[PDB]
Design a protein around this ligand. Structure first.
Ligand SMILES: CC(C)CCC(=O)N1CCC[C@H]1C(=O)NCc1cccc(Cl)c1
Ligand code: NA
Ligand code: NA
Lengths: 26, 250, 9
């Protein structure tokens, strides 16, 4: 239900160092 | 993982470790998709060519791990398997077709900052995200070269066009598979390697900003060789069997 | 190579 949302990232609007790489590939 | 880098703490809270009780050691990668179900690669449990046939009693599941070797006190959780479920048309004989397995845990694991499940794709996300060039991310404790890191490794990898995938190998590729990696021309490299099998291939949906597990780490010929690619189990294709198994055995 | 899991498990 609340899957895919990492406590230490998405839930705090923090993002990891390379996720944007994925976003930009899309 | 080859040509990756250390995970950040909490980066991959769905990452699981299939652990050997005796003798204690990393056995495979795996994923948390519920407080009671871990998803992995069928060949991690059963691969007759190498006299691999593991049963529940034989294994331990360790969730929330960063360190490969260390026992992570107050952070990691280790669980006992209640039952192993392997795909009925898993092709260990030929090409590792339907290379997928579910492991029901004896007790639900407690979610935390270091432990949290990943979503499983729906047809639309899958339709939308599984595209040549779209990048996914795989995580694992496997060797770092065709070796053995201290912490969970991470590498982002572009999905590769089906004909390239097929043209790169002698193996009969199927629709339950997709391959991933950079071409020799693209400069960047990286790949899963030994000990990463069963680990998750994830993508982040730009539609709802959740992480979906698109693939399972299945097979490769060598690690990170040029002209070769990682082959991953197509999770959305085998989803029915997954719901079916959950929607009845718990 | 691995640090021993707690006996209890
Ligand atoms: C089609 C097989 C026979 C090729 C060798 C192979 O890679 N195997 C045969 C046994 C299981 C699997 C494996 O090592 N999986 C781990 C792995 C290694 C490299 C890349 C990936 Cl994506 C996964
Ligand atoms: Na071929
Ligand atoms: Na490669």
């Amino acid at each position: 239900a609340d899957c895919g949302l990492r406590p230490l990232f998405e839930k705090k609007s923090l993002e990891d160092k390379t996720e944007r790489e994925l976003l930009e590939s899309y | 993982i080859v040509e990756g880098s250390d995970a950040e703490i909490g980066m991959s809270p769905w990452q699981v470790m299939l652990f050997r009780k005796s003798p204690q050691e990393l056995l495979c990668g795996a994923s948390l998709i519920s407080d009671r179900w871990v998803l992995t690669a069928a060949h991690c449990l059963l691969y007759p060519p190498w006299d691999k046939n593991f049963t529940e009693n034989d294994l331990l599941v360790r969730i929330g791990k960063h360190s490969r070797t260390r026992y992570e006190r107050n952070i990691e959780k280790i669980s006992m398997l209640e039952k192993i479920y392997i795909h009925p048309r898993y092709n260990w004989r030929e090409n590792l077709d339907r290379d997928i397995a579910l492991m029901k845990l004896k007790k639900p694991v407690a979610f935390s900052d270091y432990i949290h499940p990943v979503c499983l794709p729906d047809r639309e996300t899958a339709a939308s995200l599984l595209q040549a060039g779209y990048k996914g991310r795989v995580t694992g404790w496997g060797n770092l070269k065709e070796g053995q890191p201290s912490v969970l490794q991470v590498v982002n990898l572009p999905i590769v066009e089906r004909p390239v995938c097929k043209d790169s190998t002698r193996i009969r590729i199927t629709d339950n598979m997709f391959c991933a990696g950079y071409k020799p021309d693209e400069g960047k490299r990286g790949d899963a390697c030994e000990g990463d099998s069963g680990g998750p291939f994830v993508m982040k949906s730009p539609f709802n900003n959740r992480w979906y597990q698109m693939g399972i780490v299945s097979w490769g010929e060598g690690c990170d060789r040029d002209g070769k690619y990682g082959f991953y189990t197509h999770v959305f294709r085998l989803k029915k069997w997954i719901q079916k198994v959950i929607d009845q055995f718990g | 190579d691995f640090e021993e899991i707690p006996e209890e498990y």
